[PDB]
Design a protein around this ligand. Structure first.
Ligand SMILES: Nc1ncnc2c1ncn2[C@@H]1O[C@H](COP(=O)(O)OP(=O)(O)O)[C@@H](O)[C@H]1O
Ligand SMILES: Nc1ncnc2c1ncn2[C@@H]1O[C@H](COP(=O)(O)OP(=O)(O)O)[C@@H](O)[C@H]1O
Lengths: 463, 463, 87, 87
């Protein structure tokens, strides 16, 4: 017999309480997978589900000392763990799961299949998910004001759209995106609109994750990056002045792996799932201590070219090279965006961009040509070519040019190599970088006589 | 006769609960030895096992207040510990144990004998664990693409196969492996294949273990690498600039030991079993604190020399000396690898490699000749020969050489030592190494003190 | 028992130090992998800890325990490839 | 009770000092082999600590504690072959 065990068995049959691989119980309440560790929810589930049981059982789940017994049975009857958050194309709302690829919306049991334990936190209203509305027109005008639809701004606008649209996709992204531009360009407006659109899947964390060591001790500023689909960090401490701690390349290389290592306070979990699109907002170019191909492989940049200025400075805004258009600053827009007026309009816009840009595999791409630092490392790769075995037959021509040969290796004097390199690049402008490049790749050929087995591309091509 | 005690005795007689020296209470549920200090599993085992007990006892174990009583009895009945996880040639799966020496898969009672307290975490499908299948063909193609089967890459591929196959052995591996290579070469793909093949016997950890104090204080980055068979700390902090903490040699020595000291905080434990083979996916050659002969024995390296360039940058990579081959990137390969596709094919390949490379004893061997940072103390070994008694019979030759005969030894002045060091290597590039060697190996000879009683290797070999 | 080298390179009392607590009433304490002090850049072994280890009783407690004294019956052996240094 | 020179150089109260709490009701405290300040580098005998050790009360709280008031009865003796130096 034991009525309470029968009730526990039925509640297990409905398949509502589950055990995760992080050792925590997720319950299914109000058409959403709720999850908590300091306020256990199993008694809430028992009291909520008491309606579906027969009449002889529902009158017994009213005493707390019996809901706790049913809880004990349930906890002792769960042995096998399950894996959660395995679908990367479903957006979970506080009352269901919107399917991005098909466009349909599921609620109730239909949404139970997809174990999504991080929801936006606000209900999905199907009367606002419409293309035609005054809010949609106002939002479209605002977006066209922030990023104009001109001819010279096509690529930058497309990259902006792709970056904003990736905030819906629940996979791991392979770039970091920098929003760059002068003051009053609309970057924080995009931040606030995006937050109002995707709710609790948006987290703002300090700059410490980009400068401090990830592991160290406790570091909740990265332990809160667990499963959130957008991490947006602002106010880069411009490094033009001295005393500014530069950005570390290994931090960039560590914020791209599908799992970052960092733990909260009073916790041992040191593995966080990294679904987040990381967007860093800055008005000044960033500085990297070490630059290589790996760092150039994980940087993207979006530039803002519009100033919303009050008339008292409009003339001052009309005489600057850092903009391309000046508009009237709106005093009441911050209050309107704060009130979540453009929430579902922007969610619809985001879903349309997601459908457009999601060619069977959507991948964030890097743009190293727009960062001033990487120009030096790109031009050198486009100017100097390393000699190899295929150039052995033309060794006489290389010797006639001014090079020397030793042990089937082409080499030139260090001072001669420096003069040849400085023939097309500024020695004083990038002295430290040039010295680092020369020393790092220096490989002696003969006894001492340090040299580098690389020659100018134009010199090699020209006989 | 106090029925609950009879039930406790009956459950204890089957040897399903055991006490380990650390104080853990491992329980045998669902063909696996689970243990969890958070939610004790003894009540779970009682409820699971009530089926086998007689009809009178079975109905008594439906009330939590009685399962707690039986658990108390069982806890008070276990007075003797037991040694766990002793057999190092067995691979524990979530539904049994695979005998790596033979190949048979044991489940149920036959797999109970081995007190393997860790598991991969997934079932073993004998249908997929097969030699021929499309997944096997694609996986073999990928592996041959990462490390080519060419004759020049013979030793490298052999070491690569051995380093990966040592992830199945349950012994205490005696070396460290460095996955070193340029960007976009295949290190992360191999890490993900290994992570999806070995399962939960694989953990990622930060760089604190290799750069900071192992003991210090509470360090969960060492408590989690207990009984793990593969630890994959990665992303070394770009030691090219030499502006960051170097990996302390003491850490390297303490890591390659049968026990590693960590986690002095709570949940009693101070020592952890170092079953793991540590692989550090680097990007530049490592920089150490103090180079010694002991640290020359506990370090290896595997070099990846095949690029996976985008079609736009195929030409640029085709002219780089850091790549011995250039191929075209596959966009959806990572999606398939992370989707647990090549999970059993790679386990089969690893088992085959394990059988191939396992002589009567398998041992990892270092390759210190690869690391440039270890060259100088190696070069000194080939450039300096200590005084030998049998070399005394060269009086005329010693007089012709110019050495000073003092205390039945050949000594030279400090200026002569500096001249010999300059003639042995570049002064600027090896001044620190020469000074450190002179300071460490200084003896009592020549004028006053600070004299090295070691002749040049060529001079010592010569009469 | 084998414990890390925090015994020689830090204040004995400090906070909770289970490393010294597990040495309670032991006989053979091996500590290995001592850094080379010839090259600057490593904290040296303090003479205070060396003097304290020779006392009959040593101070230090485990975590979630009120027992703060531990008898020093042990022989401490440090395995090092380089000569040690002291303050 | 026998204590080291830890109180003769560092701040008397400062942080959690075991000897600060151990001076509670102990009738005698002895320090031996003082860290001679004659050679350059060694800290001078802390005049603040010597001045603060004379009062009939002891202020000090160890780790995981709140009581800071101790009755002082100990006679303090220092033994060494070097003349003390106080800045
Ligand atoms: N569409 C718009 N029309 C008019 N003013 C706008 C518009 N979008 C933004 N603004 C103005 O810019 C502000 C938001 O951008 P702001 O935070 O000033 O940018 P930044 O953070 O880059 O300095 C708004 O509060 C308003 O003052
Ligand atoms: N055999 C292969 N064929 C094609 N692309 C591959 C192959 N192996 C890996 N790749 C791709 O190469 C890219 C970079 O590989 P990865 O190992 O992550 O580089 P890194 O070693 O620099 O971390 C990814 O797109 C990955 O899917």
């Amino acid at each position: 017999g034991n009525k309470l065990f029968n009730i526990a068995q039925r509640i297990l049959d409905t398949n509502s309480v589950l055990l995760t691989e992080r050792g925590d119980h997720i319950v299914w309440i109000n058409n959403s997978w709720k999850f908590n560790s300091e306020e256990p929810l199993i008694t809430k589930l028992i009291l909520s589900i008491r309606h579906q049981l027969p009449k002889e059982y529902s009158s017994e789940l009213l005493c707390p000392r019996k809901r706790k017994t049913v809880e004990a049975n349930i906890r002792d009857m769960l042995v096998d763990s399950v894996e959660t958050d395995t679908y990367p194309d479903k957006l979970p709302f506080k009352n269901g799961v919107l399917d991005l690829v098909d466009g349909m919306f599921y609620s109730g049991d239909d949404a139970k299949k997809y174990t999504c334990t991080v929801s936006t936190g606000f209900k999905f209203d199907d009367t606002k998910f419409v293309e035609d509305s005054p809010e949609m027109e106002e939002l479209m005008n605002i977006i066209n004001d922030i990023q104009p639809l001109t001819d010279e701004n096509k690529k930058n606008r497309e990259l902006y759209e792709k970056t904003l649209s990736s905030c819906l996709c629940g996979a791991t992204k392979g770039c970091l995106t920098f929003f760059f531009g002068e003051t009053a360009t609309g970057k924080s407006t995009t931040k606030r609109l995006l937050k109002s659109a995707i709710g609790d899947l948006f987290v703002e964390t300090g700059q410490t994750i980009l400068t401090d060591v990830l592991d160290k001790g406790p570091n909740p500023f990265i332990a809160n990056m667990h499963l959130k689909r957008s991490v947006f960090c602002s106010e880069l401490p411009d490094f033009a002045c001295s005393g500014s701690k530069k950005i570390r390349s290994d931090n960039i290389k560590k914020l791209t792996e599908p799992c970052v290592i960092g733990r909260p306070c009073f916790s041992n979990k040191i593995n966080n799932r990294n679904h987040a699109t990381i967007i860093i907002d800055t008005n000044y170019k960033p500085v990297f201590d070490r630059i290589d191909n790996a760092l150039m492989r994980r940087i993207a940049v979006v530039r803002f070219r519009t100033h919303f200025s009050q008339p008292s400075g409009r003339e001052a805004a009309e005489n600057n090279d850092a903009y391309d258009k000046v508009k009237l600053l709106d005093e009441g827009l911050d209050g309107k965006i704060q009130n979540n007026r453009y929430r579902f309009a922007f969610l619809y816009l985001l879903v349309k961009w997601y459908k457009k840009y999601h060619i069977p595999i959507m991948k964030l791409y890097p743009t190293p040509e727009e960062i001033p630092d990487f120009a030096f490392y790109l031009k050198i790769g486009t100017l100097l070519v390393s000699s190899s075995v295929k150039h052995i037959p033309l060794m006489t021509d290389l010797s006639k040019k001014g090079y020397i040969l030793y042990d089937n290796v082409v080499t030139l004097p260090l001072t001669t190599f420096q003069q040849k390199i400085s023939k097309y690049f500024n020695s004083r402008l990038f002295g430290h970088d040039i010295e680092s490049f020369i020393n790092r790749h220096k490989k002696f050929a003969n006894v001492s006589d340090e040299y580098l087995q690389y020659i100018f591309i134009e010199d090699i091509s020209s006989p």
